[PDB]
Design a protein around this motif. Structure first.
Motif, PDB file in Angstrom:
ATOM      1  N   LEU B  17      -1.609   6.349   7.906  1.00 40.98           N
ATOM      2  CA  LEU B  17      -1.318   5.181   7.087  1.00 40.98           C
ATOM      3  C   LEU B  17      -1.730   3.877   7.756  1.00 40.98           C
ATOM      4  O   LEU B  17      -1.974   2.887   7.060  1.00 40.98           O
ATOM      5  CB  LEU B  17       0.173   5.171   6.752  1.00 40.98           C
ATOM      6  CG  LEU B  17       0.754   4.116   5.818  1.00 40.98           C
ATOM      7  CD1 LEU B  17       0.107   4.234   4.470  1.00 40.98           C
ATOM      8  CD2 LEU B  17       2.253   4.282   5.696  1.00 40.98           C
ATOM      9  N   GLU B  18      -1.851   3.856   9.084  1.00 39.39           N
ATOM     10  CA  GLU B  18      -2.290   2.634   9.747  1.00 39.39           C
ATOM     11  C   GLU B  18      -3.771   2.365   9.532  1.00 39.39           C
ATOM     12  O   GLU B  18      -4.200   1.211   9.606  1.00 39.39           O
ATOM     13  CB  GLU B  18      -1.998   2.696  11.239  1.00 39.39           C
ATOM     14  CG  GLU B  18      -0.544   2.605  11.593  1.00 39.39           C
ATOM     15  CD  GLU B  18      -0.332   2.720  13.080  1.00 39.39           C
ATOM     16  OE1 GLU B  18      -1.328   2.943  13.802  1.00 39.39           O
ATOM     17  OE2 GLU B  18       0.829   2.615  13.528  1.00 39.39           O
ATOM     18  N   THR B  19      -4.566   3.390   9.280  1.00 34.57           N
ATOM     19  CA  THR B  19      -5.980   3.153   9.065  1.00 34.57           C
ATOM     20  C   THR B  19      -6.217   2.592   7.671  1.00 34.57           C
ATOM     21  O   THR B  19      -5.487   2.894   6.726  1.00 34.57           O
ATOM     22  CB  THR B  19      -6.770   4.438   9.252  1.00 34.57           C
ATOM     23  OG1 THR B  19      -6.328   5.400   8.294  1.00 34.57           O
ATOM     24  CG2 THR B  19      -6.535   4.977  10.632  1.00 34.57           C
ATOM     25  N   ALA B  20      -7.260   1.773   7.548  1.00 29.56           N
ATOM     26  CA  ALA B  20      -7.595   1.142   6.279  1.00 29.56           C
ATOM     27  C   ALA B  20      -8.330   2.072   5.331  1.00 29.56           C
ATOM     28  O   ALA B  20      -8.731   1.635   4.249  1.00 29.56           O
ATOM     29  CB  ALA B  20      -8.434  -0.110   6.516  1.00 29.56           C
ATOM     30  N   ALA B  22      -6.527   4.283   4.085  1.00 30.25           N
ATOM     31  CA  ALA B  22      -5.372   4.416   3.208  1.00 30.25           C
ATOM     32  C   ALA B  22      -5.339   3.399   2.082  1.00 30.25           C
ATOM     33  O   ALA B  22      -4.436   3.488   1.251  1.00 30.25           O
ATOM     34  CB  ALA B  22      -4.085   4.304   4.016  1.00 30.25           C
ATOM     35  N   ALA B  23      -6.253   2.434   2.039  1.00 32.10           N
ATOM     36  CA  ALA B  23      -6.470   1.661   0.828  1.00 32.10           C
ATOM     37  C   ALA B  23      -7.359   2.384  -0.171  1.00 32.10           C
ATOM     38  O   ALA B  23      -7.400   1.983  -1.336  1.00 32.10           O
ATOM     39  CB  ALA B  23      -7.079   0.302   1.164  1.00 32.10           C
ATOM     40  N   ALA B  24      -8.061   3.434   0.244  1.00 32.23           N
ATOM     41  CA  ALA B  24      -8.904   4.190  -0.670  1.00 32.23           C
ATOM     42  C   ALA B  24      -8.187   5.372  -1.304  1.00 32.23           C
ATOM     43  O   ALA B  24      -8.779   6.050  -2.147  1.00 32.23           O
ATOM     44  CB  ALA B  24     -10.161   4.686   0.044  1.00 32.23           C
ATOM     45  N   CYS B  25      -6.943   5.645  -0.919  1.00 26.92           N
ATOM     46  CA  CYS B  25      -6.152   6.694  -1.544  1.00 26.92           C
ATOM     47  C   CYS B  25      -4.731   6.196  -1.725  1.00 26.92           C
ATOM     48  O   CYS B  25      -4.299   5.249  -1.071  1.00 26.92           O
ATOM     49  CB  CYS B  25      -6.153   7.982  -0.724  1.00 26.92           C
ATOM     50  SG  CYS B  25      -7.744   8.820  -0.667  1.00 26.92           S
ATOM     51  N   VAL B  26      -4.001   6.840  -2.622  1.00 27.39           N
ATOM     52  CA  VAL B  26      -2.658   6.405  -2.989  1.00 27.39           C
ATOM     53  C   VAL B  26      -1.702   7.541  -2.646  1.00 27.39           C
ATOM     54  O   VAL B  26      -1.631   8.553  -3.351  1.00 27.39           O
ATOM     55  CB  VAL B  26      -2.574   6.009  -4.463  1.00 27.39           C
ATOM     56  CG1 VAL B  26      -1.176   5.673  -4.837  1.00 27.39           C
ATOM     57  CG2 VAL B  26      -3.452   4.810  -4.704  1.00 27.39           C
ATOM     58  N   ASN B  27      -0.955   7.379  -1.562  1.00 27.17           N
ATOM     59  CA  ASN B  27      -0.206   8.479  -0.975  1.00 27.17           C
ATOM     60  C   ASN B  27       1.168   8.594  -1.613  1.00 27.17           C
ATOM     61  O   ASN B  27       1.998   7.689  -1.480  1.00 27.17           O
ATOM     62  CB  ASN B  27      -0.078   8.282   0.530  1.00 27.17           C
ATOM     63  CG  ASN B  27      -1.391   8.442   1.237  1.00 27.17           C
ATOM     64  OD1 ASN B  27      -2.173   9.326   0.914  1.00 27.17           O
ATOM     65  ND2 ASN B  27      -1.648   7.582   2.210  1.00 27.17           N
TER      66      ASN B  27
END
Lengths: 50, 49
Positions: B17-20, B22-27
């Motif tokens: 989740l710290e990596t960006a 995680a803006a390309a997927c919705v967890n």
């Protein structure tokens, strides 16, 4: 005097605030438009694409 | 003779989740993931003429 009766529609008609795109060419302002939306959504050909 | 220095490595923790990315997927968290068979997505495309 004749302009007061040539303008028979466009005295009473209420003004409003319409949004589009504008540009300066010489000293005559043109509105620029595209008709993407009227002919892309619906699988109909745009009549400008001759 | 002697032991001058005895040195090692530490691997710093890098979660997802710290990596960006995680803006390309919705967890969305889900608990009992072996219980699911499938999912379903139900669209509705209206279209004028």
């Amino acid at each position: 005097g004749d302009k007061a009766a040539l303008a028979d529609g466009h005295d009473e008609i209420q003004r409003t605030r319409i949004a589009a795109s504008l540009v300066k060419i010489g000293d005559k302002f043109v509105a620029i438009e595209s008709l993407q939306r009227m002919y892309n959504e619906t699988q109909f050909p745009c009549p400008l694409n001759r | 003779e002697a032991l001058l220095g005895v040195y090692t490595n530490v691997v710093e923790f890098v979660k997802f989740l710290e990596t960006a990315l995680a803006a390309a997927c919705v967890n969305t968290e889900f608990k009992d993931l072996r219980r699911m068979i499938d999912g379903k997505i139900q669209f509705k495309i209206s279209m004028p003429t």
